[model samples]
Target chain A: SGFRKMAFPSGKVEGCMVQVTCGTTTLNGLWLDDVVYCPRHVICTSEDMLNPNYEDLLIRKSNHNFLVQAGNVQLRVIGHSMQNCVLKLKVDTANPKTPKYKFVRIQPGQTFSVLACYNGSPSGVYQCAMRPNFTIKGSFLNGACGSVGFNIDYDCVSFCYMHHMELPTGVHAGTDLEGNFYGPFVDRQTAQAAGTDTTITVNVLAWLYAAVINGDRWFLNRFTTTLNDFNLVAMKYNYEPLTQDHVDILGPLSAQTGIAVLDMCASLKELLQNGMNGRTILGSALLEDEFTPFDVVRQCSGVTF
Target chain B: SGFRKMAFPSGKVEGCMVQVTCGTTTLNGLWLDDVVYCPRHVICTSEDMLNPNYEDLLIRKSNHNFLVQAGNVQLRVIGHSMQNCVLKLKVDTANPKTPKYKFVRIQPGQTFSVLACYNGSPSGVYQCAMRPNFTIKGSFLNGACGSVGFNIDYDCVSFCYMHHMELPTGVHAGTDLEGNFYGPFVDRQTAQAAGTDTTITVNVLAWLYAAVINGDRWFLNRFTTTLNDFNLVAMKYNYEPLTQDHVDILGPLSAQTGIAVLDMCASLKELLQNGMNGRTILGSALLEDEFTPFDVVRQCSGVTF
Candidate 1:
């Protein structure tokens, strides 16, 4: 058969083509975000019967039924066109015993509000595909990239005994019994707040390396701000009064001050002790005005740094 | 000089060698436990100098004196012959900028204890020689392999300060000072405890593995005498006023079972769910027979299993 639908954002681009493939034929089109393309009508066939989210592997213990969740995804087409598309999804079970490709498909440009009962395999990496197989081609406006991926896991296992017994002679058998089940499930009763706390402290050099890897310049420039907030939250006895914003950022701190401050300060001290203090002092002096171009103009009529 | 002393359990095989090297003509022989071997003469060295622990790293801080304490150590030796050997001793420092070492000659057959004391450095692992003369043998034993490895790190910065100060100018300065001097020390205490607890668990596992790795079998055969004693102990516990031996094994067991029998069974179920059944059974078995070999000699003579 073929993919069910297709969609693209509203933006025109020259020399761009949208290819929708289903077995043999790959539909060609052009579009952008917000544009809808439904090729299910064009490529309706027996092969097009998309089985959404098949079990990555057979779980004989119970019917393979689990939930899957995903992050927000935005598709952009080459040009703003009036065409909707379909998306097929699959998963690669993280568990070795389980196979992969267990997911579902969704129509392009379909903004899913909530998904409380999606199915998931025991363990897998969920992957999505479009019905009719349409390749989205356009520049993202909010500036995102690639398909968004999420996770699902076997949260609970329930076993039922029906019509038979694996017990002693006198024990009566029953239709169903919840005797054995094991899986990981999040404790909704406790979140970050009131949860078991944890903290990790790294030296300045290590932190710099982390920042470089993450490509988070704002965090690098304002790292001192984070450490301050972390320490403040850690030292306090009562944090429930903190604003949600403050609590969210400083929640997980170094569980314990189990690292040397000397190692952390060693890098910073290198600057002061290595005889490069002059340039550092000069830089600090230049930034002493402590105001942006706009602020300086608004409040520096009679003042100068 | 030769070994200070030597000892063996009467007729045990000496499968290892002991050697001590000093000056060219320094008397070399055997040391059972510190008595110098001078052919026919046996002179005991002063306790201060005799049997000095040698395989230790000492860290000294500039703020403190030159004296370094034996915070911890990593000692390892290979024996060519239990009766003949060279006692090689070496010391190292943690800080490369201020690396240090001391050489000592220990006598074979001597029960040597390793230790050191440093101003800044506590018990920790550190390389002695670096760069061209580096010995990457990894000073592991007590230094890095065990909880003692971190003992020295709690002391001070031997060569320079740390880099944690740049964190919070608002409060980072005050806290940083405390942290530099006391931070690692405080943290090291908790870290060391955690590491040691893990070792304790590992040791327990080692003991269990040692007992059963060979698939040694124990049945209700040769253990009849031990089982008889066990029955007697059990009988004694039934008496209102128990003897010392009975109290030793079954001290106030009934009084402790406050909950109903079914409730206790449910608790047991919960523990089993957590994979703790085997451990719980082992604990009781150990307490009942002191874990000594027992035949448990009766079949239906009081057995309900």
Candidate 2:
């Protein structure tokens, strides 16, 4: 069937956060002097508008957050293996912003391109003209069979969709061509090797989330909420949840309990199991993203087997 | 008894659309070089950031859309009977952007203020310090009883809440204040005169939507989508509706029919009827906004009755 493949060409799938990670830095909403770069948003003022140098301002919340910068943010492409894997993604620099922040909401068939090189060498910098849709089909890296890795190097996360559930698979560490449990020589590396750039496009979101649940960070609730920001927005209106309709959907817990991202995840799958793809606003092309938050496949993937 | 009485100060309750009204204009999202002032958002360019006079740019979809200018867009406050009722509101110039576009989403008790005048006079100018929460309380021009009016004057729609449904009331137009069915001279004017601006904090959302449904715009679906932006967000996690829960609740329509604003309105009332108040993200003070999109009061308020 569709999206049922369990393999991630890389030895093990690594989870990426959809939100901007500050890494131990608390955002106090301050404005400083510098050429700043934000993958998501940059706030400014009328005074800042007058400034000759004003690319970075804080706390600017509007429909314009993601639109502040164009192709400045880069998506990291990495394979599980060390030096052999080299991948990177920079969306169309032509357009400055992607309004709905989620990778899923990136409109289908939108003008986009991909570039790849083998072992980070310029000799094979292959660029592929493409668009965002079902599969992010692309190619190149004509030289080596080193494993491939990919992720959002910016504040946003990289996601995948439609993989089956409960299906368990694991990856081990070893560069040696010979080992007891591991397989044979030349055939082993090329057999599972993602020398093919097209391999980056397969298997994604659940892996990122499963990693969250497994890291015990799910219990932290703060970062968990941040992680949920994307998932929740995937189903929300204006960046928050919906009214009366949602209350009744989970009214049983309304008075008794407020909600968290994980709570919605549990609630999300049941709805998806029944097949609820939301309609668009103003007939916009957006639809429910193909994510399986409650899937055992996603959940189990988060655990260290 | 809170928000129970359903009377609109105007002769006829008028519906407001939260969506920017470039009316009869299909949004192809194209931009021109002219200086544009938007109440909700303004897109721009990195090159625009470099230009000395780059106040106007388009296709820029960042979280900075609204942070572009301050003290610019105005909210119109109109009472019925021509010049008899004069009121006006401009959000705080101290700060310019409201990340959440909807009024209900405004932080509870934030530093906001109001201004009013009587018979359109410079002599009676009055102002009040206020914040947005359950009630928008204030005072005014100090002379006439002419009903009061309030609404968003920009691309965004004005909204109100907590009023009950199916609650019936109506207003009649007149400057003379002399009709037999109408009341006496002096007693008539100031009775419901709203000279005491606090009168507005009284009744309100049902009236607006009732007018929309009663006006048949609900049928166009195009406009209906625009109106729902606020209501849906009042309860939604994003500007769109929710995931599985919404799907399962309304899932019966999933495989068969899609949804619209009015549909969510119907679904909303039922949820509220059950006491389902949504929680704030990261403990944000915003809960479900107090609006009734499907009340008999709001419904009848829309009609000439």
Candidate 3:
């Protein structure tokens, strides 16, 4: 009565089901974005899973489903090629205890169970003889390297009753599942175009770095092109922009200028400093969108040289 | 006798100088790469400065120099336009006990002084009127947040004496400075054509991120192009390469397929799987160099969906 169908891409990945061994509870659920939502949702013990992204882990769907065996995440692979298939993962979870109700919830410091979870990545699965014994131990759902590893240890005891009551109870209400069914992004929405609406100038570096690690090419291209084009215009208008060539002596920018330019030429300086040089300069009035801001491209009178 | 000429690009920055009141130590040195090497060099108390990259901090050179005030990095801006120049910085230093010989060095845990220095950026200086009262105190360098900040408590008591005596003593003797003076990269010999001759796959994401932060366009371009090209070829050759379009039915490549394709199609799969379909596929034999590897474009039977 409690189950969700999992989705997979084409090729060798078809028909693959990720079933977990939660001891006695043979629960079925969805695996969306590295998260497992069974019949009942909220489990504080599973909170740690939200930390780092699992883009690199061996999972079938960003949003998927499977059976829960005790605590082990089993990989139900029936295809013959499953042997060459190795299920490697790094799952992080807290010391998951049985939830009284449907789920559990708790805070970081309050949960005494979070201590040792300061761990690392990995766990793996090889072949599926009678449908391959491919299973990623729930403990392995944590995070780290080597074999299918699990590093999450949360005191989700309270969460069980809390979440269970919320979902199951909500069924009684009939209109709330949509509310807690999905979770997602952050500083992300903050990326806007209101001139001063960008992230802290100084932090632009890390933000870009984060985007890169996340492999958000969409994000990277927008930023790189924005600054690069702005610089081209800035330089064309007889203003300075940050580029390797600046180390040039004729006014060769030493590292300071070179780096300042690299900092996306801040203070809105990337746009503002050269901003005064000409309205036509930063006046390009770049089109803004969800990934970036409208005024995000202008003002802040921001520079390298 | 101790003075290093500072270089700048043409413009309002022409005569800008970053001086310091280091109390009485009006020592001259290069500000290369966010570090100041006052004539003698090597100081343990100043070691915390190395923890994080200071690209975003108000620095002048990846490799430049300036006067060392008691500890404050003073901006000697005499230019009229310099008024807009509010020198914001997050300089970190230890108790900065002047080295008996020249510099100081230390370590963590060994120094009980570390307990408190575990801190947080900044001290900003407004014009040359007084310049930046830039300074940091503690035994460790945590992170920065503009203005000026400090965090370091490694005490590093013994390291100071031990390293100082080593460099200065040997300096009148020659070679030591070059060795102890320069610090560089790891898991980073560079990339090339030979697939095996590359950085750890797991570590690739970070290296790319760092490159993005450092504004290393050369490196970023090389990597992006390499993988994008490989993926295109893999897809052309009827193999799966990670991209957003997946998640198709007939096996909608949930997140796993999408992401596995994203991990640069590892085990060199981006190149090999397609490599198998047609040596002609990944056989473009990408040209590699110091920024990347030649074979770096190949092997490591690796991932996504």
Q: Which candidate gets the maximum lDDT versus the true structure?
A: 2
How do the residues B196-305 of candidate 1 rate in per-residue lDDT, one tens digit apiece? 10011111212122222212112102222233443343243331121334323222221232222222223322322343322323212121111111111010011110
Candidate that scores best on TM-score: 3
TM-score order of candidates, best first? 3, 2, 1
* Two-chain DockQ for model 1: 0.01
**Runs of candidate 1 exceeding 4 Å displacement:** A1-227, A237-305, B1-305
TM-score for each predicted model, relative to the true structure: 0.15, 0.17, 0.19
> Which CAPRI quality tier does the interface of model 1 achieve?
incorrect
What would the per-residue lDDT of candidate 2 be over residues B123-234, giving only the tens digit for each residue?
1111111223123322211121221222222233222221110101111111111111112111122223312111111011222232233221222223232234434544
Top-down lDDT ranking: 2, 3, 1
DockQ for all models: 0.01, 0.01, 0.01
For residues B249-271, what per-residue lDDT tens digits would candidate 3 score against the true structure?
A: 10122132232324433434333
Candidate 3 regions with alpha-carbon error over 4 angstroms: A1-305, B1-305
Specify the poorest-scoring 10-residue window by lDDT in model 2 chain A. A162-171
- After superposition, the stretches of candidate 2 with alpha carbons farther than 4 Å from their true spots are A1-305, B1-114, B117-259, B277-305
